[PDB]
Design a protein around this nucleic acid. Structure first.
Lengths: 154, 102, 37
RNA sequence: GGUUCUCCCCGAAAGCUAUUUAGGUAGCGCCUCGUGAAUUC
RNA sequence: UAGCGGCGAGCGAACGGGGAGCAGCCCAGAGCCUGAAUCAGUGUGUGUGUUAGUGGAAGCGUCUGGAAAGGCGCGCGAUACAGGGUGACAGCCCCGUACACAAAAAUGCACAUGCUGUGAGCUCGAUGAGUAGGGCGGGACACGUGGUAUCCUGUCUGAAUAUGGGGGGACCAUCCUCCAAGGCUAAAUACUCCUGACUGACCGAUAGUGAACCAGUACCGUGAGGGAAAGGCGAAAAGAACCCCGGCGAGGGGAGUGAAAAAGAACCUGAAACCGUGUACGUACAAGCAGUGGGAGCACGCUUAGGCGUGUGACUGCGUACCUUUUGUAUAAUGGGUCAGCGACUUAUAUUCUGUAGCAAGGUUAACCGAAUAGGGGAGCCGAAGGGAAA
């Protein structure tokens, strides 16, 4: 569908099937439980999850976040210098407190800026888990990040 | 590298006597300092037949935690943190907030 | 002391290879009394 | 000797049958949960 | 798994492929030529690391309370909120983290120079003799000397170099390689008694380890082996001057100190069971493991008449106590003194069956690798030619 922006208002094209599918409550729950079990160390509780089931869950969560406008697509999100204040200010003006900065490529300046903040977390598209996506109140993506998400989801 | 030393003007930050100034008499290895004139404790001194027979009630000084006191700036009239800096190869202490050497 | 240390002492076990394994367990479990005297 | 706390509905047997090789192998009408189910009884 | 066994339960291989976190050497070398190339050992100097340290920004105040780490209003900080301690739950009052520096000694991985160094390229040759087989006398290879292969061969003897031997998923045949005494081969993978850092849907004094402190303890045995209980110190010891009673004690009562003293060396909070005091009710004519219910009298608070409720409650009526073990348990047949704490997991590894959920005629990868759960990878297990006994 069409993903409305808030700064450039530039149209974005995303596959309807991978972002508009119904919300599979049962599938999402099983993946989340499996992810939590895998986090343990039993000091093994890891559970197998089918690749299609894992992918299907991510599509469902992404669709739900879009519907509940918890997902915001923006242009490049970078900080000129590795200072937490700059990141904090760039989020306060945006009125974001619990956000997940999912960027197309990991940037050291952004990574260092968000490392101290606990309500603010920065990750790459590869490093995404269902638990983090649901837990974080808002998720802001980049155009490149969305594009790479489209292809690897397929 | 101790902020509080043998002869320092300190002000209490917390406790029943917060805000009163004093001079540290000695510092214990357990992170405690003894400052005269604030932490008065009435100790019932048991009499002894030795050379000393003070008996009665003595007004001793009870040690307090190092973190409970701060060096008095003596210029801004308020407590201030103290750090270390190297000058001509000698480590010295300095205040903050218009930091100046001791 | 007389007929007690000559057969149940420290040197009574080190004289052969069989008694060496007996004093080996005293090293892992060091009690207050190693041997009688 | 002992299958442990609580709880709602339902719930196989006595001296027997075939009959060997004995503290047992095939096997029990009536009864239970699910399915099939024709006025069949 | 293809095989093997009274084909009873069991035990038990290889090539190819999917994954390269492997790096393939020296001697039999004469002669023209040596301190060569590739490397190691032993010293010094420079540069980069490991093992002891230092500097290192950032919250001032007020209300309640004895005391503030939390609350309200205004800010700084944030490559740093990993954790714990600092009078109550602490980024910024302390102890630890970014950034920036030092080398008198020792050690490890690339590079200048020096001494001793088993030593290359080109040309001219070679590709491993007390052995195989056979004879006499034994044992171990599951097999008693069998229809018997292969492995080891003391003493007395003895061949050959495409005219002799083995292998190509083993009759006979052909071509190539190979055909007996040499010398070496790192790391990863195995293993956790000691150090530092880090981690957790493990536990918190009958738990965990015999043992959280003076636990490899007191104590017992000839030695050895084996083998208990016990911190809930307080934020800071402010851990009772003086006076009274008494035995110049123990124990207890005042005062003083402290936010709190039935927490006073049994010392934060102090349950059940056992054993007492004060008040109220019943019993000295009551029915033998009698509890609830019905009923009268009395007491501390119903209550602007209201025998409304609880404990106690003379007397009446109904009923052969309870659990385990059994063809029965009211039994001269048998078992437990009670309370508190603790206590006999349905897990891991195959197969089979059921329920739940994603592409709709590509449903599924394990280990390893990976910005360490996604992506990438299909060599297997479970399926996609039914109908047809089978074909």
């Amino acid at each position: 569908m069409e993903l409305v922006l808030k700064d450039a208002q530039s149209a974005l094209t995303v596959s309807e099937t991978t972002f508009g599918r119904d919300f599979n409550e049962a599938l999402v729950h099983q993946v989340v439980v499996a992810y939590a079990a895998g986090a343990r160390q039993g000091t093994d509780h890891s559970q197998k999850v089918n690749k299609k089931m894992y992918r299907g869950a991510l599509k469902s969560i992404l669709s739900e976040l879009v519907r509940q406008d918890r997902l915001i697509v923006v242009e490049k999100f970078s900080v000129e210098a590795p200072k937490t204040k700059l990141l904090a200010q760039k989020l306060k003006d945006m009125a974001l407190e619990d956000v997940l900065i999912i960027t197309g490529e990991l940037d050291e300046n952004l990574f260092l800026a968000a490392r101290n903040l606990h309500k603010v977390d920065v990750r790459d598209a590869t490093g995404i888990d269902p638990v983090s996506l649901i837990a974080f109140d808002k998720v802001v993506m980049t155009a490149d990040a969305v594009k790479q998400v489209e292809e690897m989801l397929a | 590298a101790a902020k509080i030393r043998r002869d320092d003007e300190v002000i209490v930050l917390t406790g029943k006597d917060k805000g009163k100034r004093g001079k540290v008499k000695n510092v214990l290895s357990s992170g405690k300092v003894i400052v005269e004139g604030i932490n008065l404790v009435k100790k019932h001194q048991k009499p002894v037949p030795a050379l000393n027979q003070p008996g009665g009630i003595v007004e001793k000084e009870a040690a307090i935690q190092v973190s409970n006191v701060a060096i008095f700036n003596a210029a801004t009239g308020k407590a201030d943190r103290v750090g270390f800096r190297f000058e001509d190869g000698k480590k010295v202490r300095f205040f903050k907030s218009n930091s100046e050497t001791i | 002391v007389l007929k007690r240390n000559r057969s149940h002492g420290f040197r009574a076990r080190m004289a052969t290879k069989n008694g060496r394994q007996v004093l080996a367990r005293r090293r892992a479990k060091g009690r207050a009394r190693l041997t009688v005297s």
